[PDB]
Amino acid sequence: PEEYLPNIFEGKKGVIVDYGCGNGFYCKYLLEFATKLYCIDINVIALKEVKEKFDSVITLSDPKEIPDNSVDFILFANSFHDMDDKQHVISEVKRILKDDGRVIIIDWRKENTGIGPPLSIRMDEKDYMGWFSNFVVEKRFNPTPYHFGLVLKRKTSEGHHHHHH
Amino acid sequence: SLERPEEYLPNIFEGKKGVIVDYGCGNGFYCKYLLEFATKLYCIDINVIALKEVKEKFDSVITLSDPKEIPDNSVDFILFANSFHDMDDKQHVISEVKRILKDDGRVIIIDWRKENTGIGPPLSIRMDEKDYMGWFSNFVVEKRFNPTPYHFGLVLKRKTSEGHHHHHH
Ligand SMILES: [Zn+2]
Ligand SMILES: [Zn+2]
Ligand SMILES: [Zn+2]
Ligand SMILES: [Zn+2]
Ligand SMILES: [Zn+2]
Ligand SMILES: [Zn+2]
Description:
2 copies of one chain form a homodimer. By secondary structure, chain A is an alpha/beta fold.
């Protein structure tokens, strides 16, 4: 995790959102790069466990109170596939992310791996880029043999720019 | 500046730097004074642009439309500075005040006296001590102070309770 994360945040420390933190695994690895760190999760127990370890982290049930055009990186570590309200999620990601921000996807490979979650709930790159349709992949990486990783960025737009700042 | 908060805030906060909430922060007047005392500072206001101006000037401040995302039993001081009397959902506000405040937390009220002082908001919308304690009825006044000659000021603590303590921690 040290193996791959620094490559991604190496250049630019900033406002990070751990979107669907559950486990709380990735938080310690994000704190080193974070001016502010938000952890968002619908599960209240999971949020308590994080507040108990890490007092500086802003815990939220939902991204509503994250200001518009304020976020540098959003991480979905194994979290998006079973998240509720995927449309609302994508819509909030677009609102909170700066024009120059990045979305980081880490999820299980769409293969029988033996461990990890049920195969029917798993998504692959092509599935992610259906939901994240205003984005394009900028890098790929391999967190473990059973996972994949994307770093995503907004499609360059020429139309109007209605994204509020 | 009619209000000179350097003259009464320190006496309140001195012993006890901590988690503070400016509830109805509006103007954002009190923020610089509260920053020198807050381990965390939350600013709450329904007015979306008022919050914007607070964000533009004070980046450590956590701005919220509402106190929902503030954790249970996590707060030391809550300030209501000229803000309760016209606040929406007063019973929802008291309820949230009770949920987020610690057992030993304090509520600070500053508001306009309920007489015609010429300056200030219309006399009809104003509340005195007695009005405040109808809303903050699980609390008692611990100290009183006079921020200005047109304002009153209270420091409030929770009533001591013999019974159950259902307040989640
Ligand atoms: Zn715990
Ligand atoms: Zn829904
Ligand atoms: Zn934009
Ligand atoms: Zn402004
Ligand atoms: Zn209402
Ligand atoms: Zn309690």
